[PDB]
Structure formats: C-alpha cells, structure tokens
Design a protein around this nucleic acid. Structure first.
Ligand SMILES: Nc1ccn([C@H]2C[C@H](O)[C@@H](COP(=O)(O)NP(=O)(O)OP(=O)(O)O)O2)c(=O)n1
Ligand SMILES: [Mg+2]
Ligand SMILES: [Mg+2]
Ligand code: NA
Ligand code: NA
Length: 327
DNA sequence: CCGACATCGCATCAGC
DNA sequence: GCTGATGCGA
DNA sequence: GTCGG
C-alpha cells in the first residue's frame, strides 16, 4: 500500500533498470529490476534485511546483496559511480527522445553528441521519427488528463463515423482501464469488410480524415494495419494551446476484435502474466487468437469469443475489470 | 550450468 | 530493382 | 537478474 515505505530501495531498482535497458542493452535485466521494484512496492512492511526481501518472488541473490549495502550505508556504490559517468548518463538521457534507442544513443554519444542542444545542431544525422521526438520532447513526457482524453475521444469517434458508419473505434490503453491520466492515446479500429478472411484503404481514409480537420499533425509511421503519429486538441480562442500528444491507431480484423481489445487495453505486465499463465493451463494466447494447446502443444484452431471474459474462462481466471488489470 | 523471459508492424539499413 | 536483418516502440 | 530445467 505504499511508495514511501521502501522508496529508497524501489527507486534504486528503477534507476538500475533504466541503465540496463539504455546503456547495457539488456531488456530482461530491465524487466527483472522492474519486477523486483513492483513486488517490493506492494510489500506492507519496512524491509530490514536483504534476506527478508529475497523471500519475495522476483527478488533473488544479487538484489538481496544490493539491498544489504543500501541498508547499511544509505547508498549503492555501483549506482553512485554510474550516475557520475558522463558517457553512461548521456546515453541514458538521449534515449528519452522517441526514435532514439540504445543503439543510436550510443552512436551519437560516441561522436560527441550528448545533449538536446547537440541534437538540434545535427539534424542531418536524424531520421524523420527522431526529428519529431526531439521537436516535441517536452510534450511527449507530459501526462494527459482524462478530461483531455475524453475531448480527444470525441473528435476521434466523430470523424470515424463521418467516414463510414460501419467502423467501430475503441479507445483502449490506460484510458480504458479508467486511469486519471494517460501517457498517450490508443485507438483500436474495425470494419465489417475486413476479417481474417479478406475494401482497400480502410486505415488510410480514417487517418486522412483526422488530418483534414487538423487533429493529426505528424506521422511517425503508417501502413495498412497500423499508424503511429502525433495529435492535438484545438485551442479555445482566447485560451492557450494544448500539448502535442502521441496517438496510435491500429486496424484489427472484426472477427478477432475482442482479443485485440484485451491486449491493447493491457496492462503491460498483465498481458505478460496472462500469456505466461496460459502456457501452464494448456493454452496459448496472442492479440489475435486464443488457441487450445494440444498435448505437446500443437495449438488447435482459433476458438470463438464474443466478450472479454470468454477468454478469462478458457484460461480459467476470475474476470477482472479493466480497472483491475495493472498486473 | 544454461536458456526463457512474446511477438507484433513499420522505417531503415545491409547486401545480392 | 529486390529480400532480408536490424532497430524501435509498443 | 531470476527462475527452473
Ligand atoms: N510492451 C508492451 C507495451 C504495451 N502492451 C500493450 C498493453 C498496453 O496497454 C498496450 C498499449 O501500450 P501503451 O500505450 O504503451 N501503455 P498504456 O496504454 O497501458 O499506458 P500508457 O503509457 O499509455 O499510459 O500495449 C504490451 O503488451 N506490451
Ligand atoms: Mg496508452
Ligand atoms: Mg500507446
Ligand atoms: Na525469491
Ligand atoms: Na527513445
């Protein structure tokens, strides 16, 4: 029930997580540190020893050692040192630009480019995605109040039906889990003339419409089944301008619609725990189709599903509402 | 001691 | 020209 | 880094 309880520790693991991801390029250590931080964050006691923390799932030998040091000194020497290392701190920060991953960030820092200022000086060395992530650096780190999400949802739902009233658009992600604020907007899309069976420009025409009314402002990537870009709420004539926001639109076949709603509603860790738990209950689920495993796991055919708890029963879990799907 | 920890679409690079 | 590998964010 | 084969 508390961030403050073991906050010194959970911050330590979060920092260590980011450096593995961005500097050491180890996505699973990043995931491992996060898991440890999470379960420790829900632990309703103030941890007194590393042996005490090791008891929790996700916490093992090394993190136990790290906790002992922190508790008996108040610092982590490995972390103190990596904090003050110019190269490692520069690589880490640069990855906060959308489009710049660990590879490119390491590349830029190697040739002397270490700040936003240096980036804004070297546009020739940037792909289109990166120029936009740089441009809207501040805004993309701002959270979106649910009030604005509802306003955003209004424009989207309106223009979708305006193109063709047989479309269905569902706003998923954290917004659908009911969160008070979101980091971006996720839009699920479907149309009767697109199933797992076979109208050519379904995604293009929705996007084209949203650009027409000046909702979508930039395009990070776009194809037949998926769009990633930037959007903006129009301002009140006297009042100031809104931040540019990240938006993703994806086109999913209608006959697989609900599995997509489940997945893109999330959450992140929740989907990992469902697909890790299907493999022990003789199932295997992705964003398209839950399939009943065979004996050695030979994957049967795509079942029917006409609501989200259909899936929860196949897998035999209690139907948790979206608001309870953080993990 | 050692591999799994999920897989996806799209931009861009490596190379025939 | 093309296919495939990689990086990236989800 | 953690878990389990
Ligand atoms: N790595 C990831 C990231 C997201 N997802 C699914 C669950 C996420 O809810 C859904 C959308 O990703 P997302 O926008 O990045 N996260 P989410 O919407 O949950 O929260 P926010 O960042 O928006 O606030 O993707 C996933 O399965 N694996
Ligand atoms: Mg979201
Ligand atoms: Mg998103
Ligand atoms: Na443990
Ligand atoms: Na980034």
């Amino acid at each position: 029930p508390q961030e403050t309880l073991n906050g010194g520790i959970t911050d330590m693991l979060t920092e260590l997580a980011n450096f593995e991801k961005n500097v050491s390029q180890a996505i699973h250590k990043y995931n491992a540190y996060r898991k440890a931080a999470s379960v420790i964050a829900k632990y309703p006691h103030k941890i007194k020893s590393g042996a005490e923390a090791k008891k929790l799932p996700g916490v093992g030998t090394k993190i136990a050692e790290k906790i002992d040091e922190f508790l008996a000194t108040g610092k982590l020497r490995k972390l103190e040192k990596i904090r003050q290392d110019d190269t490692s701190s520069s690589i880490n920060f640069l990855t906060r630009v959308s489009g710049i991953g660990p590879s490119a960030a390491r590349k830029f820092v190697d040739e002397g480019i270490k700040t936003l200022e240096d980036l804004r000086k070297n546009e020739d060395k940037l792909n289109h995605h990166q120029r936009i992530g740089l441009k809207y650096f501040g805004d993309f780190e701002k959270r979106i109040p649910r009030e604005e999400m509802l306003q955003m949802q209004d424009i989207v739902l309106n223009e979708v039906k305006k193109v063709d009233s047989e479309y269905i658009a569902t706003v998923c992600g954290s917004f659908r889990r009911g969160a008070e604020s979101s980091g971006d907007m996720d839009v699920l899309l479907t149309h009767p003339s697109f199933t797992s069976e076979s109208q050519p420009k379904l995604l293009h025409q929705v996007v084209e419409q949203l650009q027409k009314v000046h909702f979508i402002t930039d395009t990070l990537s776009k194809g037949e089944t998926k769009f990633m870009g930037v959007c903006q709420l129009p301002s009140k004539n006297d009042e100031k301008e809104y931040p540019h926001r990240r938006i993703d639109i994806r086109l999913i076949p209608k006959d697989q619609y609900y599995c997509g709603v489940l997945y893109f509603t999330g959450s992140d860790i929740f989907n990992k725990n469902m697909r890790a738990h299907a493999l022990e209950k003789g199932f295997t689920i992705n964003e398209y189709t839950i399939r009943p495993l065979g004996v050695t796991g030979v994957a049967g055919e795509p079942l029917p599903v006409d609501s989200e708890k259909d899936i929860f029963d196949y897998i035999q879990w209690k139907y948790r509402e979206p608001k309870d799907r953080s993990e």
